[PDB]
Design a protein around this ligand. Structure first.
Ligand code: NI
Length: 341
């Protein structure tokens, strides 16, 4: 049965609610982004209207085989009417195709559902600037001050400089980058660009990437592994055993591997600056964990909410324990007292 925080009151609408069977009273199912925790339950047999971005729609059709007659893609930054209610989709600064959704309810209530997001000051100049929000359904993934990490731009700078140094010292080193979902494509794209290489990957992953509307993508990726010195592998293979095994398969073209695991936050963020990060090494294999986040840091989240000044906040993440729920509610009250709304 569908939890309350996935239902939009005053509407026929749910958000990211595909794993509950037919939801009583739902006339339109919204999907914020193509990550499995949110799409869980969709397939070619789904026969209700799904509302989403163009990019999400391309993934639904090609990877999950959802039939075309039920996919309803909407443009970003454009007022749309859905079953008699005005909606707007806004870029979430998450993975490709990820949206926040603004619902303008018949009674005058305005609701913002952030999906998954990485808050940014550029959001303060979207269509949000114009009007008041009564209810905010908030991605609270890192809602505690211990959660700090660098900008995406500092993390990419580190990765480009690390990769370019290693391969310039040893032309026979291979770079490997781990993946398990869409998102974080800048990591492997920026490294391949500095090295003058295409990124090499499986057919299944190439297919995924071709649904993302990335400009000049045919210029940046390939399935011909032999021609590439940046390879993508499943995240579970990014360990000394799985990397050794991979180096076997490269037919003595390479004698060293430098590998990257983009994670979210890890506790080494509490102690170590990005500049100072070092790898784990075994023989001719080194692995760097890099804190490339597609969710808000604590301070980013706080700034966004104190700018928005919502009347009520409903968390969508960390809601399963009373200790988490208490922690979040205490921070929301602090932010409101400090900013005076
Ligand atoms: Ni996500």
């Amino acid at each position: 049965t569908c939890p309350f925080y996935k239902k939009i009151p005053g509407t026929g609408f749910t958000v990211d609610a595909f794993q509950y069977g037919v939801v009583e009273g739902c006339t339109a199912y919204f999907l914020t982004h193509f990550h499995s925790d949110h799409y869980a339950g969709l397939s070619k047999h789904f026969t209700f209207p799904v509302y989403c971005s163009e990019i999400t729609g391309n993934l639904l059709k090609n990877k999950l085989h959802v039939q075309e007659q039920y996919i309803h893609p909407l443009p970003l930054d454009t007022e749309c009417i859905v079953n008699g209610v005005k909606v707007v989709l806004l870029d979430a600064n998450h993975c490709p195709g990820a949206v926040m959704i603004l619902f303008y309810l018949p009674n005058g209530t305005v609701i913002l559902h952030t999906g998954d997001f990485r808050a940014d000051p550029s959001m303060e100049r979207s269509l949000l600037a114009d009007q008041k929000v009564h209810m905010l359904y908030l991605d609270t993934t890192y809602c505690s001050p211990e959660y700090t990490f660098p900008s995406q731009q500092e993390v990419i700078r580190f990765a480009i400089n690390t990769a370019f140094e290693a391969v310039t010292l040893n032309p026979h080193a291979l770079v490997v980058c781990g993946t398990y979902s869409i998102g974080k494509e800048k990591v492997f794209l920026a490294i391949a660009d500095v090295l003058g290489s295409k990124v090499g990957m499986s057919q299944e992953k190439y297919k995924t990437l071709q649904c993302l509307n990335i400009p000049e993508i045919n210029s940046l990726i390939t399935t011909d592994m032999c021609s590439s010195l940046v390879h993508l592998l499943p995240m579970m293979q990014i360990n000394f055993k799985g990397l050794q095994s991979h180096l076997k398969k490269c037919g003595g073209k390479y004698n060293q591997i430098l590998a990257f695991r983009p994670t979210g936050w890890t506790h080494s963020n509490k102690f170590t600056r990005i500049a100072d990060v070092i790898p784990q090494t075994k023989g001719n294999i080194s692995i760097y964990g890099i804190p490339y986040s597609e969710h808000s840091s604590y301070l980013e989240m706080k700034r966004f909410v104190q700018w928005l000044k919502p009347q009520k906040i409903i968390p969508t993440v960390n809601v399963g324990t009373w200790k988490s729920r208490s922690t979040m509610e205490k921070y929301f009250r602090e932010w409101k007292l400090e900013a005076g709304y």
